[PDB]
Design a protein around this ligand. Structure first.
Ligand code: 7LP
Ligand SMILES: *[C@@H]1O[C@H](CO[C@@H]2O[C@@H](C)[C@@H](O)[C@@H](O)[C@@H]2O)[C@@H](O[C@@H]2O[C@H](CO)[C@@H](O)[C@H](O)[C@H]2NC(C)=O)[C@H](O)[C@H]1NC(C)=O
Ligand SMILES: *[C@@H]1O[C@H](CO)[C@@H](O[C@@H]2O[C@H](CO)[C@@H](O)[C@H](O)[C@H]2NC(C)=O)[C@H](O)[C@H]1NC(C)=O
Ligand code: PLM
Ligand code: NAG
Lengths: 199, 239, 98, 267
């Protein structure tokens, strides 16, 4: 391994800045590229640095390269939920197709979103084909709540959705089973005291 | 400068033959195959400087490469093994250093195919309580009973894919966490405004693309051959 | 591919019984891979120095072998060269008078 | 009027085995050696660092160290790129440096031979093939000319570094460059071919004639200049004569080291 990234992983809150590092021993070192990779997706180039002492920018991403130190830093300013991804450092050893690319193993960034107007509730939803089958949706809780997963009851991990046109985000988790009800569903989780349970 | 890969996802059996294809209409002479495994950077397997040229990379063992034309570069696994489970990336380039990467191909090589099973899919309609309390409507989709965990879940409204207002569990959960070859469940939410859900001209569909057996894989069991297929569930809006 | 020319000549005027230096100058060859031996009475002289290989304006290679020797009435001295351009090794003998 | 030559010769036997060796000449005096066995360039004179500081020399050597490894892999990759057009074994020669004229004037060069034939040079801002070169080389040229970093560095080495460095060498090496070493001559004969041997002279310019009193014998055939191991030269001049005319004949040698006091050796 000629390319090392630090930190391995980090968790930040929306709006915070973060600093990612790349250290390498690759020789020679023609250029260094930073990729963003979302989960299950591919490699989106953010920037490439070419000079002995270089600085680049691209929107909220900015980066530096020092070839004497064999070091690069990627700065993300004012993080958003969609920065959640793995960030990958790559050094090319030639300024042409004769080069080999040397890839770092990546830095995982998680960005916790800011839930302005929480409204925690547990709703019951019925199957469109089979009105006797149902699931329980725990939703609209802020990011201070944690969800905890009987082995015949299933509870998913939390997940944040983004209704882009309304500038609105919300967390939810889902629970189901087949003496099971939605009032009982999330008992093993420390849910907010103000949680709405209808009907 | 674009690059494509097929298939995008593949389940195979140990000892089987798997071919991963890369296509590129940029007229680039040079093409490159990599694999990405967690805890490692991308590693070069084979590359090629033009039609008929094939060259060993850093980790060529277990793989042949084929460059029949300028356009196509294939990675051939003649005797597939579990260790070849990975995400494979192809790239191309001209004389410059930039490598233009494809979208990646996910390969799972199972020891045996006996437990491969497609999902059942159910769509759960929004709570009337949620509608009145928030003026929003959350649909939930549940894919259940499937193995292995190579599925792509997508949401469609009036025949067009929606991403806004969606979130899908990062990974499937095991239905029998004790058992070694447990089947999986996966859930997803699509949240829309109450008025959009209340419109009975809107048709909502949750689609699960399941990756399983090809036409040519052996099947000895009585039950239906668990082939690569789409399973979906749908519902119309209502007042 | 080009055949080596071989020239053998002493550094100082040769007097029998006096220490001198014998040179073997090998030129005009290609490729550069070559095996050069200096011989006393057809046996390989052990302490043979080589200059670094270099090449001329025409891209052909040249190199200089040399060794300490003392000439006598009886003893012969030779430079033997193996090169891909020749089927057999080529030997040129040192001649005081030439 | 001095020419500085860095001569590099590389042999690639097959896909795995290779070596690269170089020597450096200022005129006919060797200033550097870099064997494949060595990690570092070696000085072959006290003044071989020129007027460079240790930091400037260290920097230059490091660049060359990176070059040799990169060069080796590049050739190997270019072979793969062109196959099956060219196969091993492959011989590459580079001749690079600068010719120094008086004042501040110089001209630099970087010439490349492939299998013993001059095919490529760096000229201006880029690599190019020269007349007679095969067309398949256009791809290697295109690939080399894609490397902007290498082009900028080569342009700097050729335009600036080479002449600056060599001006310092000429200053530092003055007493070796201006050395005078005296020829010694001796005579002999074979089947009759008379041989006038001349050895130990520096610098190269020398005049050798067979004589009868004042009469220059126009039969005199000069041989080639041959090196001695101690950085002096050797030359011999042969004559054809009939057995009986040997008396009266002399060999006259003129050379700058002798201060007009020529060597006359009578048979
Ligand atoms: C005497 C010339 C001195 C050249 C020094 C240039 C810098 C150099 O070392 N640069 C190589 C490294 O480049 C990489 O690192 C640099 C940083 O140190 C830069 O970042 C650069 O951008 C990056 O690419 C480079 O690898 C170079 O290509 C080395 C070899 C150059 C050379 O011989 N070329 C001429 C001879 C080739 C003609 C071959 C013909 C041929 C073709 C096919 C088969 C056989 C023969
Ligand atoms: C370096 O100098 C060259 C000068 O030309 C020759 O090539 C050198 C490498 C060397 O062999 C010299 O002795 C020669 O005189 C410059 O090349 C010119 O660049 C301009 C634009 O940059 C271009 O329009 C000209 O056509 C080029 N000249 C030729 C003959 O092709 C080069 O730019 C110099 N570079 C630097 C960084 O100084
Ligand atoms: C010429 O020099 C190179 C570099 O020193 C040699 O290549 C190395 O060989 C060793 C041992 O065979 C390997 O472990 C290294 O990986 C090689 N180094 C590099 C940088 O490639 C080469 O063997 C030498 N050639 C000869 C004929 O001696
Ligand atoms: C080779 C470019 C010409 C200009 C170089 C000027 C600096 C002098 C360096 C002297 C060291 C010679 C190193 C040998 C390089 C080689 O491997 O060909
Ligand atoms: C490559 O060449 C070297 C030297 O000519 C030789 O000794 C070596 O065995 C060769 N290797 C192969 C794999 O042919």
């Amino acid at each position: 391994t000629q390319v090392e990234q630090s930190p391995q992983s980090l968790v930040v809150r929306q709006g915070e800045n973060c600093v990612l590092q790349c250290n390498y021993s690759v020789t020679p070192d023609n250029h260094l590229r930073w990729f963003k990779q979302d989960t299950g997706k591919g490699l989106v180039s953010l920037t490439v640095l070419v000079d002995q002492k270089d600085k680049t920018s691209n929107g909220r991403y900015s980066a530096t390269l020092d070839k004497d130190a064999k070091h690069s830093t990627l700065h993300i300013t004012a993080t958003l939920l969609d920065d959640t991804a793995t960030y990958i450092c790559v050094v090319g050893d030639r300024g042409s197709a004769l080069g080999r690319l040397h890839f770092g193993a990546g830095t995982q960034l998680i960005v916790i979103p800011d839930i302005q107007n929480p409204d925690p509730a547990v709703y019951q939803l019925r199957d469109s084909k089979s009105s006797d089958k149902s699931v329980c949706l725990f939703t609209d809780f802020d990011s201070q709540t944690n969800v905890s997963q009987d082995s015949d009851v299933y509870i998913t991990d939390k997940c944040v959705l983004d209704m882009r046109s309304m500038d609105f985000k919300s967390n939810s988790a889902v629970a189901w089973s087949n003496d099971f009800a939605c009032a009982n569903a999330f008992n093993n989780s420390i849910i907010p005291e103000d949680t709405f349970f209808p009907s | 400068a674009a690059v494509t890969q097929s298939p995008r996802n593949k389940v195979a059996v140990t000892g089987g033959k798997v071919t991963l294809s890369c296509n590129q209409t940029n007229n680039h002479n040079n093409m490159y195959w990599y694999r990405q495994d967690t805890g490692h950077g991308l590693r070069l397997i084979h590359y090629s400087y033009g039609a008929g040229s094939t060259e060993k990379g850093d980790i060529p063992d277990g793989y042949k490469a084929s460059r029949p034309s300028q356009e196509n570069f294939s990675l051939i696994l003649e005797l597939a093994t579990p260790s070849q489970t990975s995400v494979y990336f192809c790239a191309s380039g001209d004389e410059g250093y930039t490598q233009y990467f494809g979208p990646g191909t996910r390969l799972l090589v199972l020891e045996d195919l006996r437990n491969v099973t497609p999902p059942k899919v159910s769509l759960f309609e929004p709570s009337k309580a949620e509608i009145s309390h928030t003026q929003k409507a959350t649909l939930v989709c549940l894919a259940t009973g499937f193995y292995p965990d190579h599925v792509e879940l997508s949401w469609w409204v009036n025949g067009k894919e929606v991403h806004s207002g969606v979130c899908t569990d990062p990974q499937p959960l095991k239905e029998q966490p004790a058992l070694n070859d447990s089947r999986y469940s996966l859930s997803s939410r699509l949240r829309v405004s109450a008025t959009f859900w209340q419109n009975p001209r809107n048709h909502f569909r949750c689609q699960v693309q399941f990756y399983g057996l090809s036409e040519n894989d052996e099947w000895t069991q009585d039950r239906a051959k668990p082939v690569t297929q789409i399973v979906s569930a749908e519902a119309w809006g209502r007042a | 591919q080009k055949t080596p020319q071989i020239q053998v000549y002493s550094r100082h005027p040769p007097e029998n019984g006096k220490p001198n230096i014998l040179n073997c100058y090998v030129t005009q060859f290609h490729p550069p891979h070559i095996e050069i031996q200096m011989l006393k009475n057809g046996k390989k002289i052990p302490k043979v120095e080589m200059s670094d290989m270099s090449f001329s304006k025409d891209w052909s290679f040249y190199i200089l072998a040399h060794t300490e020797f003392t000439p006598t009435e009886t003893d012969t001295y030779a430079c033997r060269v193996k090169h891909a351009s020749m089927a057999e090794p080529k030997t040129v003998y040192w001649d005081r008078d030439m | 009027n001095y020419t500085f030559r860095c001569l590099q010769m590389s042999s690639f036997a097959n896909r795995s085995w290779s070596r690269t060796d170089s020597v450096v000449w200022l005129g006919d005096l060797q200033t550097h050696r870099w064997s494949n066995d060595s990690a570092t360039i070696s000085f072959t004179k006290p003044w071989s660092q020129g007027k460079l500081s240790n930091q400037q020399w260290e920097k230059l050597q490091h660049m060359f160290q990176v070059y040799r490894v990169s060069f080796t892999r590049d050739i190997q990759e270019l072979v793969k790129m062109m196959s099956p057009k060219e196969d091993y074994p492959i011989e590459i020669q580079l001749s690079a440096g600068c010719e120094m004229y008086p004042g501040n004037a110089s001209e630099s060069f970087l010439h490349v031979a492939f299998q013993g034939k001059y095919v490529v040079r760096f000229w201006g801002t880029s690599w190019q093939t020269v007349p007679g070169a095969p067309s398949w080389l256009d791809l290697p040229i295109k690939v080399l000319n894609a490397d902007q970093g290498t082009s900028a560095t080569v342009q700097m080495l050729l335009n600036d570094t080479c002449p600056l460095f060599v001006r310092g060498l000429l200053e530092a090496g003055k007493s070796d460059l201006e050395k005078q070493e005296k020829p010694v001559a001796w005579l002999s004969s074979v089947p009759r071919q008379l041989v006038c041997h001349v050895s130990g002279f520096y610098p190269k310019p020398v005049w050798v004639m067979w004589m009868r009193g004042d009469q220059e014998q126009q039969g005199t055939h000069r041989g080639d200049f041959l090196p001695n191991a101690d950085e002096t030269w050797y030359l011999q001049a042969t004559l054809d004569v009939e057995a009986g005319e040997e008396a009266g004949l002399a060999c006259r040698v003129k050379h700058s080291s002798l201060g007009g006091q020529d060597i006359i050796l009578y048979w």
